[PDB]
A paper describes a structure:
Biolayer interferometry (BLI) analysis of trimeric variant S proteins revealed limited (no change) and moderate (~2-fold) enhancements in ACE2 affinity for the Kappa and Delta variants respectively. To investigate a structural rationale for the observed changes - or lack thereof - in ACE2 binding affinity, we solved the cryo-EM structures of the Kappa and Delta variant spike trimers in complex with ACE2. We found unchanged and moderately increased ACE2 affinities for the Kappa and Delta variant spikes (compared to wild-type S protein) respectively. The combination of these two opposing mutations, one diminishing ACE2 affinity (E484Q), and the other increasing ACE2 binding (L452R), is consistent with the unchanged overall affinity of the Kappa S protein–ACE2 binding interaction. Interestingly, the overall unchanged ACE2 affinity of the Kappa variant S protein stands in contrast to the majority of previously characterised SARS-CoV-2 variants of concern (Alpha, Beta, Gamma). To this second point, we verified that the Kappa S protein dimer-of-trimers complex is labile enough to still permit ACE2 binding through our experimental derivation of the ACE2 bound structure. We saw no evidence of S protein dimer-of-trimer formation in our cryo-EM images upon introducing a modest excess of ACE2 (~1:1.25 S protein trimer : ACE2 molar ratio), despite an identical S protein concentration which resulted in the dimer-of-trimers reconstruction.
The Delta and Kappa variants of SARS-CoV-2 co-emerged in India in late 2020, with the Delta variant underlying the resurgence of COVID-19, even in countries with high vaccination rates. Herein, we report cryo-electron microscopy (cryo-EM) structures of Delta and Kappa variant S protein trimers – both in the unbound state and in complex with the ACE2 receptor – to gain insight into how their mutations underlie changes in ACE2 binding and antibody neutralisation escape. Within the receptor-binding domain (RBD) of the S protein, both the Kappa and Delta variants share an identical substitutional mutation (L452R) with the previously emerged variants of interest B.1.427/429 (Epsilon). Finally, the P681R mutation (present in all B.1.617 lineages) immediately precedes the furin cleavage consensus sequence (682-RRSR/SVA-688), with initial reports suggesting that the P681R mutation enhances cleavage, and consequently S protein post-fusion transition.
Numbering used by the authors:
A (entry chain C): 299 to 330, 530 to 620, 641 to 675, 691 to 694
B (entry chain A): 14 to 69, 77 to 145, 158 to 176, 185 to 247, 257 to 298
C (entry chain A): 745 to 827, 856 to 892
D (entry chain B): 745 to 793
E (entry chain A): 943 to 1041
F (entry chain B): 992 to 1041
Write the structure that this text describes.
Amino acid sequence: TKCTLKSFTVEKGIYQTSNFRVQPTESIVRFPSTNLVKNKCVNFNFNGLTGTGVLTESNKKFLPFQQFGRDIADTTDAVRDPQTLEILDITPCSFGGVSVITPGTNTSNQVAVLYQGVNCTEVNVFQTRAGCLIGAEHVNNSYECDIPIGAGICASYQSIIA
Amino acid sequence: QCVNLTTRTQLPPAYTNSFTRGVYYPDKVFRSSVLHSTQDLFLPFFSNVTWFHAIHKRFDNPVLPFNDGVYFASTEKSNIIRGWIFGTTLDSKTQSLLIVNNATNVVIKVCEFQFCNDPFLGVYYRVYSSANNCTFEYVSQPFLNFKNLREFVFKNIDGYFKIYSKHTPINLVRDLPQGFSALEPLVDLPIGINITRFQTLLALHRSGWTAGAAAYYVGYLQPRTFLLKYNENGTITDAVDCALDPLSE
Amino acid sequence: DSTECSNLLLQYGSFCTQLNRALTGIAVEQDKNTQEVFAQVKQIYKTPPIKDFGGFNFSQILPDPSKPSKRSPIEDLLFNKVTNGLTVLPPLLTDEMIAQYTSALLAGTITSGWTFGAGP
Amino acid sequence: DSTECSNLLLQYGSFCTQLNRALTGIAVEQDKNTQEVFAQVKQIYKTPP
Amino acid sequence: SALGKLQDVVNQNAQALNTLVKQLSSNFGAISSVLNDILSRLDPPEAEVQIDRLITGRLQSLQTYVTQQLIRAAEIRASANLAATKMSECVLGQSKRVD
Amino acid sequence: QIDRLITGRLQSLQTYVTQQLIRAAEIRASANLAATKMSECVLGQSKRVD
Ligand SMILES: *[C@@H]1O[C@H](CO)[C@@H](O[C@@H]2O[C@H](CO)[C@@H](O)[C@H](O)[C@H]2NC(C)=O)[C@H](O)[C@H]1NC(C)=O
Ligand SMILES: *[C@@H]1O[C@H](CO)[C@@H](O[C@@H]2O[C@H](CO)[C@@H](O)[C@H](O)[C@H]2NC(C)=O)[C@H](O)[C@H]1NC(C)=O
Ligand SMILES: *[C@@H]1O[C@H](CO)[C@@H](O)[C@H](O)[C@H]1NC(C)=O
Ligand SMILES: *[C@@H]1O[C@H](CO)[C@@H](O)[C@H](O)[C@H]1NC(C)=O
Ligand SMILES: *[C@@H]1O[C@H](CO)[C@@H](O)[C@H](O)[C@H]1NC(C)=O
Ligand SMILES: *[C@@H]1O[C@H](CO)[C@@H](O)[C@H](O)[C@H]1NC(C)=O
Ligand SMILES: *[C@@H]1O[C@H](CO)[C@@H](O)[C@H](O)[C@H]1NC(C)=O
């Protein structure tokens, strides 16, 4: 945060610092050819079409001639495996902003990390609609908003609570 | 063997409306609940499609220019129509493509056939005399009141000859039915030869000869844009011709 | 994910930082707009349990206890009638809290008139 | 009227559609502004003779 | 058409986002719109030129999108300021201002 | 050469559209003010000073 804001003192608030781009674990090449893995972010190569995505089971019933699948925005989100006649959805690998919630450096040096739009199971861990918040203890009491997190969630320093 | 047929009765070929027929899948991409615009070789909606009859004495087998693409509609019963002939000069000088479906199996050949002036098949109740340089053979599954509607679209782009097909159960007696039916792509054929003229193959009935009751329609493709509608199951159910009328535009 | 593309992109300078800063400014501006419009009272007023207002009926605009969202019938109708590097940030104020703010404003303007807007 | 220029222009995508849409929005906005300023009465009143 | 004003804002934002994603499919004069195809099909001396063309086209598209978003944000900010003024003067008091 | 002409003309057109949108926003603000003056000054008597 200090490097991002170009200052050695950081005021109280939430500051977006980086991006959490999940890294691809393996490379999968499928031809009508290594083994196929699922539920992991891998580099897929389906019949010369390459990319990086999580391959999950699909509920889309493809026609026998169709091989690829596109959404509204013309991006390939479905594929048919050449070796075994099955349909797979490509969800994109998890990404989001990484924001640092801190009070003033005059008060404390404790920080909390918010991963925007990221589930907590694949990254003091609390799941919010805004994303996964690490380093803040969730409490059941309600106070006035000090540092805005989002989706009705706010953070404060008293340790950092959410 | 070739036989001249001299018992035809003179009649001009008919014309009718294409309605909303001739639509095919532009690519092999599944799409769900979306509208997609494509600029491809398509048949215009409500266009003037040429109508030919086989009835007894009409035996319509002319040789037509291929143009940029061909839509073939067949109101067929008892499977009289057996195949097609594609080429440029239809002799041994050039190389020609032959598609046939006899009583047992479907044969695709690319040879320099010495074609007959009147080639036909015969059923009792003769297409070429020679084939010198054959470069490709492909054996495939059987493709095939009028009871069956057989719709085919033939394109020759980038040396690839695309055959799109659809079978529809119909009960209309004379003209084309009014409705929507998307043609699934059937055969992508790697020929890489020039095609400018085609001729369809009929079957005679012998008991001279008798022509079975059949009717076919020939339409030509032009480059245009269509707006295709994809349902929840990925089947094309509706299309819009962007150049037909201002409402569709 | 192309490292060569990012290496080439770094030659153009701080364009990406400028665009991120502008989008972040717009995103915080939306929350500021909602805060300015709806959060004009710091006391959450509540209506009396008995709705004796001299013959005036406010059932269509007051929150419905039967509904889990605690919205008015008009508000419920309004919510029913509205239907690669890209992320959508959630709003700071949820629909329940905005409904609560409108409920507080309605309770203040029904039980206290304009007095709550100028003081106690 | 250059066909080659239009063919090269097609590579850049829907920029032209965006510009036309923005200009159309401005054009309808001007009419909306005139309606808002002047069309505030639905009765055409007339002075006595 | 009672709630047209909110619907127009939602439609404009969604349309702008959709157009921004659609701009990725344009090659902007390069051989292909896919970076992976350029990396797999060409050597780095020509690949740098192709990615340079794609980067400048996508950067121009993103700058256009950000500029449109800033103008729309200014319009929505003006509308929100008007809404706050109505909330203060019509709900929290009785206003003598005509219409 | 045509690509250079296209990029220059497209940049000019985008710039023109951008200032047109900014001026449209300014004119819209002025029109909103004019509508407010028409409602409060012509169709009623206004107590707002100046
Ligand atoms: C059927 O009729 C056609 C046309 O009359 C015959 O084709 C002719 O064949 C001779 C060769 O014997 C050529 O010299 C002519 O130029 C051809 N005519 C045309 C118009 O191409 C065909 O041979 C006949 N079939 C049989 C079996 O005789
Ligand atoms: C205020 O108005 C509401 C609705 O306008 C009244 O609720 C209705 O009550 C009658 C009789 O109990 C029911 O048959 C209707 O179905 C109710 N309508 C709704 C929408 O709930 C209510 O009775 C009125 N009076 C008070 C004191 O609340
Ligand atoms: C179809 O073409 C024929 C001549 O080729 C013409 O007589 C007929 O009127 C045309 N029909 C339509 C519907 O255009
Ligand atoms: C159909 O044609 C093929 C190709 O020559 C041939 O081998 C087959 O015997 C034919 N069928 C019959 C019943 O003759
Ligand atoms: C085609 O056939 C003729 C005679 O059958 C022969 O002379 C010629 O060389 C052949 N061409 C090729 C390319 O095989
Ligand atoms: C294809 O055949 C037609 C007619 O014979 C001819 O005019 C055309 O030039 C041919 N095309 C090629 C590429 O040979
Ligand atoms: C889509 O398929 C389902 C069954 O999978 C069927 O119930 C539904 O009617 C189909 N949709 C259409 C438009 O036919």
